[PDB]
Structure 1
Amino acid sequence: DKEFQVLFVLTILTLISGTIFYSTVEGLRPIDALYFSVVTLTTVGYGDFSPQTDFGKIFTILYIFIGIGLVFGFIHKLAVNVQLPSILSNLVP
């Protein structure tokens, strides 16, 4: 709960940074920048968007290393402290 709120905020800030960076330097629409940031940090990485500038490539290297750990921490916990109980609630007779 308490830890869920922090990983939420931390994830949001990371995604906001990506949205701002890729819309500015890589010229993406904000929605596309957000979508790309999420697809990147979850490692889905479709490649429909990818950085074309050297600035964008270098940022992306750093963004991945800093952001993957945070994002998957949030995912794992969104799963552990928020969805694991809810599914159990729709279990017990």
Structure 2
Amino acid sequence: DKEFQVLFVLTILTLISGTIFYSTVEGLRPIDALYFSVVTLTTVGYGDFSPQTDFGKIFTILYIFIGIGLVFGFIHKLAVNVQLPSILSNLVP
């Protein structure tokens, strides 16, 4: 519960930072910058967007290292503290 809200907040802040950075420096629309930040930090990495500037590439290196741990922490406390009970909730007689 309180574990999940902190990681939720931390993740949001991380995604806000990426959104602001890539819309400014890489010139993406904010929605595209948010989408790209998520696709990056979850390691999906389609490559429909990718940084074209050296500033963007360097930030991306750091962003990935700092953000992956946080995002996946959230993903798997979300799966553990929120979806795992819910699935059990519609199971037991």
**TM-score, scaled to structure 2:** 1.00
Instruction: Number of aligned residue pairs: give it.
Output: 93
1:86 to partner: Cα distance: 0.1
Specify every segment of 5 or more residues in structure 1 that has no aligned partner in the other structure, as ranges: none
Amino-acid identity (%): 100
CA distance in 2, matches of 1:77, 1:4: 6
Query: What SS class does the counterpart of residue 27 from structure 1 fall into?
Result: coil
1:90 to partner: Cα distance: 0.3
* Cα-to-partner distance string for 1:40-67 (whole Å, 9 max, x where unaligned): 0000000000000000000000000000
* Cα-to-partner distance string for 1:8-30 (whole Å, 9 max, x where unaligned): 00000000000000000000000
Task: Give every structure 1 segment of 4 or more consecutive aligned residues whose post-TM-superposition deviation is greater than 6 Å.
Answer: none
CA distance in 2, matches of 1:28, 1:7: 26
1:74 to partner: Cα distance: 0.1
CA distance in 2, matches of 1:26, 1:89: 45
Instruction: Verify: 1:28 aligned to 2:28, yes or no.
Output: yes
* Cα-to-partner distance string for 1:55-88 (whole Å, 9 max, x where unaligned): 0000000000000000000000100000000000
CA distance in 2, matches of 1:91, 1:27: 48
**TM-score, scaled to structure 1:** 1.00
Query: What is the Cα-based RMSD across aligned positions, in Å?
Result: 0.1
